[PDB]
Every structure is written in structure tokens, then in C-alpha cells.
Ligand SMILES: *SC[C@H](NC(=O)CC[C@H](N)C(=O)O)C(=O)NCC(=O)O
């Protein structure tokens with residue numbers, strides 16, 4: 001059922017009322033953001049994984065850009081860009097907010113995201129390293145970004161980036177830290193103690209824990225993906 | 238009074254109650270976003286222009302990144318990143334909202350901004366053109382981005398990107414269109430009729446009209462700026 005839909009597949013039917021659909025990919029960190037928010041808020045939904053290495057033409061009808069995540073509701077409304085989909089889920093569904101109601105406090109989570117916005121691009125450049133030298137230079141680049149984040153916690157003195165309770169901002173940046181390990185880039189959070197504790201507190205989170213992927217699974221996915229295999233997204237099936 | 242503060246200047250005192258301060262630069266399009274929102278919502282504020290070519294060390298205490306815009310309120314709270322400052326102003330101050338209350342409708346303005354996010358970087362690359370050839374190639378790049386925007390209006394069939402009434406999203410992208418002219422890049426909106434009408438409807442806006450800068454002024458600023466003159470930001474004084 002978790003199997004992806006690729007070229008030649010038939011476009012899905014309408015989203016049933018009382019449920020929201022997310023076009024995803026099991027190993028995509030941007031879509032994990034959305035899925036983490038979906039679990040945290042206990043929102044009923046269905047998932048359609050997209051074969052990003054061999055995607056269905058009808059998908060661009062879902063997102064002009066052709067990327068995941070993408071949400072589709074019963075009214076047929078489509079929303080793309082992970083952060084937008086997340087902010088949307090927090091506003092449109094019941095439950096405790098993941099984002100503060102307070103303007104300044106909310107703007108802070110936004111500024112922290114800006115602070116981290118460089119990591120996803122670094123992770124891409126990293127996964128493409130070749131020798132110990134490229135590697136060393138990549139570790140220093142991640143190192144500079146990790147300090148920007150440690151200062152926030154340093155200043156705040158709270159467990160999570162938005163307070164003592166986990167919130168939107170934590171879920172938004174977590175996926176990339178989740179892969180830190182499998183990517184052999186942990187000796188980058190050594191000089192950043194609090195950030196390292198944060199990673200430990202996050203893994204203890206029920207929502208985070210329920211969606212956490214195995215290193216062997218991500219390792220298998222990356223092998224195929226880096227090879228451009230139309231089977232990558234379905235690693236493990 | 239509009240004169241900028243540069244290296245050696247003294248850090249400003251507290252922001253008086255009932256007023257919000259914006260660290261700006263008269264020719265910065267990102268800060269114009271904030272200033273447009275400030276005018277539209279009729280928010281009392283003071284402006285401190287920053288000499289970006291020769292900025293005061295104390296400013297990094299305002300924004301770690303060292304860029305404008307940046308808002309500072311009486312409680313001493315600092316908020317950076319133009320879009321964040323704008324969203325903040327809409328939520329924290331009285332008046333008609335510039336952003337919709339409806340989650341999906343709000344997410345749409347956000348998706349349109351994503352759609353335009355490539356322009357600011359193109360404008361930078363453009364202002365750095367040298368010959369008619371670079372120029373021609375730049376016109377085609379802007380051309381592709383303008384169509385993405387014309388389709389939205391095409392689909393919506395409304396005057397402005399968020400409806401028949403101007404709203405947040407219009408103000409967010411306007412500054413770059415404002416400079417289109419002075420940058421000799423108008424023959425890019427020819428193949429995009431509706432977008433061209435939008436530009437005309439925007440210039441008719443009282444808020445937009447009150448903050449619109451002269452072509453000769455921006456031309457003068459750019460001459461100095463491109464030269465890295467510590468006087469650029471103060472062109473005209
Ligand atoms: S993780 C898989 C890719 N998704 C994104 O890059 C999402 C980026 C957006 N800016 C966001 O949602 O935040 C993806 O769909 N790749 C397909 C491709 O061909 O690029």
C-alpha cells in the first residue's frame with residue numbers, strides 16, 4: 001500500500017470527507033515535516049507516495065513544481081511547500097497549536113527556521129561528497145550552522161527551540177538531524193552541547209519516535225537514490 | 238533626518254511607547270515591503286536608515302545577519318526577514334488584515350510568494366549585466382518567472398493576486414516590479430498582459446504611491462551603490 005505511484009499510474013480519485021491526503025515519499029525530509037505535524041495534531045489522512053525518480057505526469061497537476069509534500073483535501077484544495085502545508089495544518093485542524101498565538105513568539109520560530117534554512121542545501125552537497133577532504137570541509141560548514149542554533153538554546157535555556165515543550169519549529173528542522181547519523185556527520189554537534197541534548201530529547205518524542213526511519217533503511221534508500229533507481233523510493237517496498 | 242547611520246555612529250536609544258521602529262534603507266526593496274505594510278495599516282513608527290556600504294557594528298546587535306529590514310518595539314523585541322516583519326505587523330496591529338483569516342486562502346498568498354521568490358535573485362544578477370547579450374538572456378529568465386505569475390491572475394480573474402482588493406501578497410512582490418522600469422526590463426511583461434495591468438493598478442494605490450521612488454533617484458542610488466560608495470544609501474541625502 002505504501003508503494004509509490006510512478007509514470008503510467010492512474011491519477012487518484014477524490015479525497016474522502018473527514019480525511020486529508022498527502023502526496024509524499026517515505027524518505028523525503030520535507031514531507032516528514034508535514035507527516036510529523038499530521039501525527040502530532042492527530043489529523044486523519046491518507047498517504048500517496050510519489051516515485052520521484054519516475055513520477056506520474058498527473059502529479060504536476062497536484063503541484064506545478066512537481067515536488068513533495070503536497071496536501072489535497074476533500075474540497076480538492078492543493079497546498080505545497082512543506083512549511084506552508086504545516087502552518088496550514090496547524091490553523092485548519094483542532095488540537096493544541098504547534099505554533100504560538102503570540103505574534104512575536106511566532107515570529108521567533110520563523111526566525112529560527114530562517115537560521116536553519118541553510119542546512120537542507122548543505123545536506124544535499126554533503127550526500128554528494130567523495131573523499132575525506134570534501135568531507136572535512138563539509139563538516140566545517142555544518143559546524144558553523146549548528147552554532148547559530150546552539151546560541152538560540154543557549155539564550156533561551158529551554159529544552160526545545162520554542163520552549164520547554166516541543167513545538168512547530170522543532171518538527172520543522174528535525175528530519176535533517178534525523179539523517180545526520182546515517183550521513184556520518186555527528187562529530188559536528190560535539191562543539192554544540194545543547195543542540196546535542198535537543199537531538200536526544202527529540203528522539204524521545206512519541207510523534208518523532210513513531211515516524212523515525214531506520215539507518216539501514218535510509219542507507220538502502222540513498223544507495224538506490226544516488227543511483228537514480230526507479231526503485232529507490234520503494235526501498236523495502 | 239533620513240540620513241543613514243554608519244560606522245562610528247552611536248547606537249539609538251529605546252523605541253518610545255506607542256511607536257515601532259524600522260531599521261531601513263531608502264532604496265532597499267525588502268524593507269519597502271515592511272514600509273508599505275506600515276503605511277497601509279497606519280502604524281506609527283520611526284525609521285533609522287542603515288548605511289549598508291558602511292554599517293555600524295552595533296547593528297549586528299539588531300540583526301545577527303546584518304541586513305535590513307529589522308523592526309524594534311518599545312519592549313525591545315527585534316524581528317528580521319521582511320516577510321516575517323510584515324506578517325508580524327499584520328497580526329500585532331489594529332486595522333483591516335492584509336492577510337486572509339482563511340487558512341487555505343492565506344496559504345495561497347504564501348504559495349504565490351514562493352512562485353515569485355526567484356525574482357529578487359534575478360534582479361541582482363540583472364543589475365550586474367554588461368552587454369546586450371547578457372541582457373537578452375536575462376530578459377528570458379525574467380520572462381519565465383512572469384508567466385508563472387500571469388497564470389495565477391489568469392486563473393483567479395481578479396485585479397490583484399489575492400482578490401479584487403490589494404492585499405499582503407501584492408505589497409510583498411511590488412518593490413521588484415517598481416524597479417523593473419529603472420532596470421530596463423519592461424519588455425518582459427509584454428507577453429504577460431494581466432501582470433502588466435496589475436502593475437498599473439498598483440501604481441494607483443495610495444500606499445504604493447506614497448512610497449514610490451523616482452527613477453532618477455533609484456538611478457542615482459544604483460550608480461553609487463554599484464560603485465560601493467559609502468554615500469550610495471544617502472543619495473539625495
Ligand atoms: S524531499 C523530495 C523533494 N521535495 C522538496 O524538495 C520539497 C522542497 C520544498 N521547498 C518544500 O516542500 O519545503 C522533491 O519532491 N523532489 C522532486 C524533484 O524532482 O525535485
Ligand SMILES: *SC[C@H](NC(=O)CC[C@H](N)C(=O)O)C(=O)NCC(=O)O
Nearest residue numbers: 265266267289304305306318319320
Ligand atoms: S535590500 C538590502 C539587504 N536586505 C536584504 O537582503 C533582506 C533579505 C532578507 N531575506 C529579507 O528581509 O527578506 C541588506 O540588508 N543588505 C546588507 C548586506 O550587506 O547584505
